[PDB]
């Protein structure tokens, strides 16, 4: 990780090297601005003392010093600007370069490698790592150098003025620098700590919010809520301990600063009264050294930031440097000229590097001539798609050599070969760009005449003619705006615009109807005479007119020949053909009212922290006055001991007050956040499912709302109260004391108070390193990088690195132009505010010398007004900067309230309704129509009806996506239909009890989902509000034939299973799903794909418990395997939501319809 320091600046032109050198010099000069100011001030105090003791010369001398101050002001102005701007510019440019190259390197990558890392994590990683690198490079280095200069100038000034007092302060300086470092780190990392604390809970929250429909089906919302509560208690305890520690450390830092003031002034009075040092000289030395030793503390955030940058840089430069075995762009690739269609495969062995232990392929040998339509038939699992992906050189075979027209692929260019193989994969997805652009994505220079010819070959011009913006329609994300058939037809067109030499279709007519598939195949035979073609499909209507048909078995191509050859061969294909023939209010505190004690105490301490600034002035002023006036030694010694004691006491009570304020308001924030997270989670579990359907509410938005809004409400309330209190104390007292002691000077400084406050705020934002607005805005340009990799379809269809690499660069170009304007504007804003501080220092003290001159007010008074007003304003600024934005937090509280008071349609807690004591078990659907609330225009149902009696094994067979699980969601009270009538034993479900119907029945999900707990508990999951006996646990485990795999495992019924059963296999987690449904003992039982991933000996041992228990309970099984369908009672076939055939299985086998084509598919 921490290697190649000089390499992080590798992407740096000459201009950026210049910018960095000039910026660091401006930094060092800025650093030598505070110390010299303290020297000038220490001499001005000597002048005020002497002249007062006498003073008509006062004014004149002060004129001189005013010039000096103004001088330094201007200097620290220019340096400041040149520093900040220049460093920002350097970082800016480098970041841009890194960004633009990184995405490029990300775009080209072996597909095997792509399999190893997740898409989501990588995408996040790009942006987050680049922002971290920039945070380092930008300003942390310049601020480090400024601090280094401020520290060394401080110590040298302190050693030249007077060396003894600066020795003493060096002695207590380590403790001071360490305090500064700790304090800076805390302020910077306070927001980060919370994200680390909450993670353990956040995981469980994310799991259960992900699998909402499942957990709702199992009634186990309460138990899950319990787990979440436990993780919340842990998070609350961590956050409270961290609050105690942060505040004890800040309290101790303040106590140490005040004790340093007390020590320095005690020793300074011993010196001054001894005659060695003047009072202004003690001030010079002490302040130069104190400020020089605080500067060291600021360096740590900068050094820590640089280490982080180095870390992320290593992992990004690995991906850049990483050279894949197969590159997408090759200049050395040999390109052929007389490209004639010829395919040669010999001894081809290859395995996926994602799972290299399993070998799917054990050698395939093929020779395909030109114009030869070759079809390959075989069950899903032999790897037709594997051969398709092997063709385009998405990988390389581990054994043998493949060749295209004589010479092998291993010495010829990859891009030239990839452009001349038109491939359509299994699933098409329409891009977001306009359809003209999508069809243009084939090749660069295509005119609209070729476009119209290609779309008329694709026969996809009717739905282009019906919809507006016939070449300007922006299709939505992932082809959601249009239908699937139009999608696949335009995908065929998108392939055909390349004018290829070898055409490869992979399941090109999955969801297509009859006539469109027919005209598409006619168009395919229209353009097959000059090219070689390979077609993979499930429908045999487009296969029978091919050249050669072949057959996969265990990855090996077994049967070869024409149609009649495989007819007389009587193989598996002969079996196949024989079988075939908004609103926000101030009610965000009314919820935390119950915690009013913590606030009262917390307000009190609050005032005291604000009040400390005036006290420290009144003593500071007075302490300097002990050497202005003309008293004897003993009076000076006694009054100086008294005020030094007051410095110590102010420190001790500052410690106590900061600790108590922090601890109280922090426990208020913690308790508010706990209660909000718990209540919001509870109301989310109670919420309906359709609410989770809405696209505005998504699986992630809910997790993000939980972890941000619940956390920001505490800011919105507590921080607001504590900030207004601290500030009103600290500024009201200051302006009143200053109004009393001298009003002429107080008006002059009140005229400037705004700018000083704004300058404190700006410096606080610099230290806090608040995230850069520009990238936050630029987020709009990231969706390109997200989509262009997420799809991974046209990217495979065409290398597309140029088109999408350039669209990304182009979208990036706009925020870059704004980033430099931002760097200049912010440099100027920083420089002006600091220079204003120095000029204020000059103008206040000059006017004060004119006042002292005309005996209008003393010197103690001008000093007290200066401190209590000017630095009171600066403290107002800093504390108002720490406060979180009130508008963000107020809107957020309104959002949380919207969720909390949200009313669910289907109540889950109420018991009202129809509660009969008995039932029979008959279900009757009549004219039921259902439309999805997210898809109001697309009707999936058109008035179904069904009659189910006791113990009637009702099979539901149909296409993938014809309303198979819809009848389940209509039974389980997920979606109530708009029309139709459902009678449950002559009892309408809409009038019954809601939890009784969810209590009675029990189902197995379409995909098995497992909570993060032990398998014995996980398999048991399914029954609640009941004492769960372990004899029923082991009985269910024997009945589902999972008892073996449980008794085999160590800690057999305590074995911790991860998220969604990712540790154990799919057949086992499907079997334990069966054992989960089994403990319910339902009188109505539903099965949805009971044998999706299961062995043939395990299907029988699953079905034997079913057949023995199918008596007494109504059973409804929905699957694609015909094994459970042959033995069913009545069978219902669907077609676009319409019941086509119903009755017994022998009646459907007599009258040959579509169920005859369904049943007879692979039998014989």
């Amino acid at each position: 990780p921490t290697v190649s320091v000089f390499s992080m600046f590798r992407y740096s032109n000459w201009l950026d090297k210049l910018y960095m050198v000039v910026g660091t010099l401006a930094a060092i000069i800025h650093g030598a601005g505070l110390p010299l100011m303290m020297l000038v001030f220490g001499e001005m105090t000597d002048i005020f003392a002497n002249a007062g003791n006498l003073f008509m010369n006062l004014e004149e001398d002060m004129t001189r010093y005013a010039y000096y101050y103004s001088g330094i002001g201007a200097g620290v102005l220019v340096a400041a600007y040149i520093q900040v701007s220049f460093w920002c510019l350097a970082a800016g440019r480098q970041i841009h370069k890194i960004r633009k190259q990184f995405f490029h390197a990300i775009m080209r990558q072996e597909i095997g490698w792509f399999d190893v890392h997740d898409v989501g994590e990588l995408n996040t990683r790009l942006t987050d790592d680049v922002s971290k690198i920039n945070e380092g490079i930008g300003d942390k280095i310049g601020m480090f150098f400024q601090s280094m200069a401020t520290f060394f100038t401080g110590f040298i000034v302190g050693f030249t003025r007077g060396w003894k007092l600066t020795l003493v302060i060096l002695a207590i300086s380590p403790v001071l620098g360490l305090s500064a470092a700790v304090w800076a780190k805390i302020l910077s990392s306070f927001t980060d700590k919370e994200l680390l604390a909450y993670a353990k809970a956040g995981a469980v929250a994310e799991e259960v919010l992900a699998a909402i429909r499942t957990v709702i089906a199992f009634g186990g919302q309460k138990k899950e809520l319990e787990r979440y509560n436990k993780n919340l208690e842990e998070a609350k305890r961590i956050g409270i301990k961290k609050a105690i520690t942060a505040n004890i450390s800040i309290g101790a830092a303040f106590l140490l600063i005040y004790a340093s003031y007390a020590l320095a002034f005690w020793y300074g009075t011993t010196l001054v009264l001894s005659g060695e040092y003047s009072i202004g000289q003690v001030l010079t030395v002490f302040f130069s050294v104190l400020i020089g030793a605080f500067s060291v503390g600021q360096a740590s955030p900068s050094i820590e930031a640089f280490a982080n940058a180095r870390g992320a840089a290593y992992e990004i430069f690995k991906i850049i440097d990483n050279k894949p075995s197969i590159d997408s762009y090759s200049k050395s690739g040999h390109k052929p000229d007389n490209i004639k269609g010829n395919l040669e495969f010999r001894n081809v062995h290859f395995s996926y590097p994602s799972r290299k232990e399993v070998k799917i392929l054990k050698g395939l040998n093929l020779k395909v001539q030109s114009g030869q339509t070759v079809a390959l038939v075989g069950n899903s699992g032999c790897g037709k798609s594997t051969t398709v992906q092997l063709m385009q050189r998405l990988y390389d075979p581990t054994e043998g050599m493949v060749s295209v027209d004589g010479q092998d692929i291993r010495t010829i260019n990859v891009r030239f070969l990839r452009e001349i193989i038109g491939v359509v994969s299994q699933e098409p997805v329409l891009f977001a760009t306009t359809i003209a652009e999508n069809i243009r994505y084939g090749r660069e220079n295509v005119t609209m005449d070729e476009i119209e010819k290609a779309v008329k070959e694709a026969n996809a011009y009717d739905f282009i003619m019906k919809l507006p913006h016939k070449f300007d329609t922006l299709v939505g994300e992932r082809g959601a705006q249009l239908s699937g058939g139009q999608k696949q037809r335009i995908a065929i067109a998108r392939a055909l615009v390349r004018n290829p030499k070898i055409l490869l279709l992979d399941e090109a007519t999955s969801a297509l109807d009859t006539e469109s598939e027919a005209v598409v195949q006619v168009a395919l035979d229209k353009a097959r005479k000059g090219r070689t073609t390979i077609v993979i499909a499930h429908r045999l209507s487009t296969v029978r007119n091919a050249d050669v048909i072949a057959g996969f078995d265990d990855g090996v191509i077994v049967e070869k020949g024409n149609h009649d050859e495989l007819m007389k061969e009587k193989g598996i294909y002969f079996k196949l053909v024989t079988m075939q023939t908004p609103v926000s209010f101030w009610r965000i505190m009314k919820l935390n009212l119950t915690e009013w004690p913590y606030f009262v105490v917390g307000v009190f301490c609050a005032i005291i922290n604000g009040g400390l600034q005036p006290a420290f002035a009144i003593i500071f002023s007075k302490i300097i006055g002990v050497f202005t006036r003309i008293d004897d030694p003993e009076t000076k010694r006694q009054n100086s001991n008294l005020f030094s004691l007051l410095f110590l006491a102010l420190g001790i009570i500052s410690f106590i007050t900061f600790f108590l304020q922090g601890f109280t308001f922090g426990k208020a924030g913690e308790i508010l956040t706990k209660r909000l997270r718990y209540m919001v989670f509870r109301s989310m579990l109670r919420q309906d499912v359709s609410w989770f359907d809405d696209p505005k509410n998504t699986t992630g938005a809910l997790t993000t709302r939980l972890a941000n809004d619940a956390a920001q409400v505490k800011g919105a309330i507590g921080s607001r109260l504590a900030v207004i209190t601290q500030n009103i104390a600290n500024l009201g007292t200051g302006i009143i004391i200053s109004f009393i002691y001298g009003w002429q000077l107080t008006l002059l400084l009140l005229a400037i108070v705004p700018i000083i406050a704004i300058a404190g705020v700006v410096e606080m934002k610099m230290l806090s390193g608040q995230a850069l607005k520009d990238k936050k805005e630029l987020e709009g340009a990231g969706k390109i990088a997200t989509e262009a990799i997420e799809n991974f379809r046209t990217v495979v269809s065409l290398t597309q690195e140029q088109k999408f690499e350039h669209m990304y660069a182009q979208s990036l170009q706009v925020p870059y132009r704004n980033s430099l304007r931002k760097a200049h504007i912010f440099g100027i804003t920083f420089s002006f505010t600091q220079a204003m501080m120095y000029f204020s220092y000059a103008g206040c003290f000059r006017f004060g010398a004119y006042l002292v001159a005309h005996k209008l007010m003393s010197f103690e008074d001008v000093l007290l007004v200066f401190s209590a007003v000017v630095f009171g304003a600066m403290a107002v600024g800093q504390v108002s900067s720490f406060a979180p934005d009130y508008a963000k937090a107020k809107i957020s509280a309104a959002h949380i309230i919207m969720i909390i008071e949200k009313t669910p349609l289907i109540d889950s807690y109420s018991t009202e309704g129809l509660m009969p004591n008995t039932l029979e078990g008959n279900v009757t659907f009549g004219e039921v129509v259902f439309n999805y609330p997210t898809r109001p225009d697309i009707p999936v149902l058109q008035g179904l009806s069904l009659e189910v009696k006791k113990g009637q094994t009702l099979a539901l067979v149909g296409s993938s996506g014809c309303g198979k699980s819809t009848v389940v969601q209509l039974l389980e009270r997920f979606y109530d239909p708009l029309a139709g009538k459902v009678l449950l034993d002559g009892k309408e479900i809409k009038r019954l009890n809601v939890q009784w119907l969810r209590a009675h029945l029990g189902i197995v999900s379409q995909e098995p989902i497992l909570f993060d707990c032990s398998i014995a508990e996980n398999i048991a999951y399914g029954d609640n509000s009941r004492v769960v006996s372990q004899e029923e646990i082991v009985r269910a485990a024997k009945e589902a034939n999972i008892h073996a795999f449980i008794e085999s495992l160590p800690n057999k019924y305590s074995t911790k299973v991860g998220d969604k059963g990712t540790q154990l296999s799919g057949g086992q987690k499907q079997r334990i799903a069966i054992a989960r449904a089994l403990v319910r003992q339902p009188h109505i039982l539903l099965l949805d794909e009971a044998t999706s991933a299961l062995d043939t000996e395990s299907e029988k041992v699953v079905q034997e418990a079913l057949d023995k228990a199918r008596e007494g309970r109504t059973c409804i099984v929905i699957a694609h395997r015909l094994s459970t369908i042959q033995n069913a009672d009545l069978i219902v076939v669907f077609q676009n939501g319409r019941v086509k055939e119903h009755g017994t299985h022998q009646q459907l086998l007599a009258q040959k319809g579509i169920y005859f084509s369904m049943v007879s598919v692979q039998a014989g």
Partner: antibody, heavy 119, light 113 residues
């Protein structure tokens, strides 16, 4: 220059109380320590009080302590010594005094007032 | 309590010459900070005493440079030179080092004629 002018005193009977006030003008009185010195008819000198500038530090030699109070009113630049319980031995001439920077206790003496304590 | 004693009480001197007064201080008068804080005073017949030296070496601003002073630890002296009839009166020593403060006994001068 500095004009210091004492007034008060005169004749008093033992156990008595008097108030000596010394008006001070010319030298921004609110910033100078002020002392009170005494001289007896034997021609000796002694110290009788000091008070810091506009402040609360008061010093006294053992004899006068508890019986003599010293105060200053800056509003008009006045210095008041209030004596009580006057023993028969405090017959004397009382001079105000000012404090010189560079630490030289009695710099400018006002004019003495005469206090006589005898039955 | 510190007791200050001036050796010569009646120091008669010829007009035009140099006369010296000596004041001996017990306890080696030394403030904590390190300054002796011993001062001399002159009182003319029928006038209020005035300051001569605010320190053993330092001379108050307005005093002829013929008045000199010298002092070490627990002993101090004052050398008037070129006696002039305006330098006739009484000479007192004051010490502010110790927490009480005490004038020494007066010494009288006389212009021999």
């Amino acid at each position: 220059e500095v004009i210091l002018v004492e007034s008060g005193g005169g004749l008093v009977k033992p156990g008595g109380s008097l108030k000596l006030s010394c008006a001070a003008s010319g030298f921004t009185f609110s910033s100078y320590t002020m002392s009170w010195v005494r001289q007896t008819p034997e021609k000796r000198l002694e110290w009788v009080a000091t008070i810091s500038s506009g402040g609360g530090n008061t010093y006294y030699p053992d004899s006068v302590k508890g019986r003599f109070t010293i105060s200053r009113d800056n509003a008009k630049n006045n210095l008041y010594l209030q004596m009580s319980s006057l023993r028969s031995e405090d017959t004397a001439l009382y001079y105000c005094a000012r404090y010189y920077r560079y630490e030289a206790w009695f710099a400018s003496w006002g004019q003495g007032t005469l206090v006589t304590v005898s039955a | 309590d510190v007791l200050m004693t001036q050796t010569p009480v009646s120091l008669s001197v010829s007009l035009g010459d140099q006369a010296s007064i000596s004041c001996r201080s017990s306890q080696s008068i030394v403030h904590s900070t390190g300054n002796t804080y011993l001062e001399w005073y002159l009182q003319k017949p029928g006038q209020s005493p005035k300051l001569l030296i605010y320190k053993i070496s330092n001379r108050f601003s307005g005093v002829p440079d013929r008045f000199s002073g010298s002092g070490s630890g627990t002993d101090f002296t004052l050398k008037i030179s070129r006696v002039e009839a305006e330098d006739l009166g009484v000479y007192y020593c004051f010490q502010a080092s110790h927490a009480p403060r005490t004038f020494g006994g007066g010494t009288k001068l006389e212009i021999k004629r």
